[PDB]
Amino acid sequence: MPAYACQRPTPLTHHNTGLSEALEILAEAAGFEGSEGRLLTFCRAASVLKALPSPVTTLSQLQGLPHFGEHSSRVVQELLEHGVCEEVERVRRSERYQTMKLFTQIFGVGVKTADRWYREGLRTLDDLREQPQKLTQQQKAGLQHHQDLSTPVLRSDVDALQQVVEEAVGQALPGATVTLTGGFRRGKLQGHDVDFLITHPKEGQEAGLLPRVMCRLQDQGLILYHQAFERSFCIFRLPQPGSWKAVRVDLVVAPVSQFPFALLGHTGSKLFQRELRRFSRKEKGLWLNSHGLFDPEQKTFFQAASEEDIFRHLGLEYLPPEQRNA
DNA sequence: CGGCATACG
DNA sequence: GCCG
Ligand SMILES: O=c1ccn([C@@H]2O[C@H](COP(=O)(O)OP(=O)(O)OP(=O)(O)O)[C@@H](O)[C@H]2O)c(=O)[nH]1
Ligand SMILES: [Cl-]
Ligand SMILES: [Cl-]
Ligand SMILES: [Mg+2]
Ligand SMILES: [Mg+2]
Ligand code: NA
DSSP states (O other), rough: OSSSSGGGBBBSSSSSSSHHHHHHHHHHHHHHHTTTHHHHHHHHHHHHHHSSSSOOSSSGGTOOTTTHHHHHHHHHHHHHSSSSSSHHHHHHHHHHHHHHHHHSTTTTTOOHHHHHHHHTTTTTTHHHOOOOGGOOOHHHHHHHHHHHHTTTEHHHHHHHHHHHHHHHHHHSTTTTTEEEOEEETTOSSEEESSEEEEEEESSSTTHHHHHHHHHHHHHOOEEOOOOOOOOEEEEEEETTTTTEEEEEEEEEEGGGGGGGHHHHHSOHHHHEEEHHHHHHHHHHEEETTTTTTTTTTTTTTOOOOHHHHHHHHHOOOOOOOGGGGO
């Protein structure tokens, strides 16, 4: 079991779901309390269990597994012995956890904003609606559409949205392409949004593209909210039987030279990308982001034609998106 | 002990 | 919280 999540395949479904969910509760709570380090350890330990080939049944099976020390091992032991971990249950039913979860799940509300509102005494969505002077326009949008945005996006929803994005993209710049990324590219059957990556085969033609896309979508009445730019975090109007629902849609534009890096960077998982960037820097001395891969000694960028190129650059076995579910 | 991913809106 |  290698130490970095990018060094091992992680399927979407696995053999330790209950154990990983418990550890991810503690990771989420650690983040709510400002401890990025503890969040990462608990996320990594959870991901190790996702990568195992069969269920953990005994504590001895944790020996030698990376990122399992006293705390994470204690959590797993209690779950194996009693089917429940007291620390996890205490977090679950704590007012702090439940409110930070409710608040951060809002589009436009992060941990720092949620924490301040918590300290000010706010607890519910109606508490926020009852004081709208304190909200940004983005947060007003996230709060107005909160109910729809709390409904899982389905794979059927994805196909319809890609068609309308392609239509708008085709008018905005003929020959431009739309690639599904994010969790649905990793094989998820549901999601909190739909993520797309847009490019054009002739380097440079993608410049200025996204404003032209957004203006056309807005003209077709399909944009319930959006902000030169190359990323947009929007809320789309998605038709439904006799009605419609709001759906979060992310659009990213990249030049074709950077497309492999942007595809890798936006396909995830979030933990997979963090681990891959950490691996690249700490083990290989290379700086990775969604634009490229930089050698800070030679002051050069690696040219990649594919995700396969990037894995090979970093000396890692290639992992298809479906195996990046760290 | 230091480190913990990344850049755009 | 854990790794090196
Ligand atoms: O903090 C973050 C968030 C996102 N991302 C990058 O953006 C991608 C999309 O980020 P999303 O937030 O849309 O997550 P997701 O598609 O993986 O899962 P859903 O909750 O949407 O179902 C991620 O998969 C990752 O590549 C990061 O690198 N860091
Ligand atoms: Cl590998
Ligand atoms: Cl770390
Ligand atoms: Mg997504
Ligand atoms: Mg997204
Ligand atoms: Na949020």
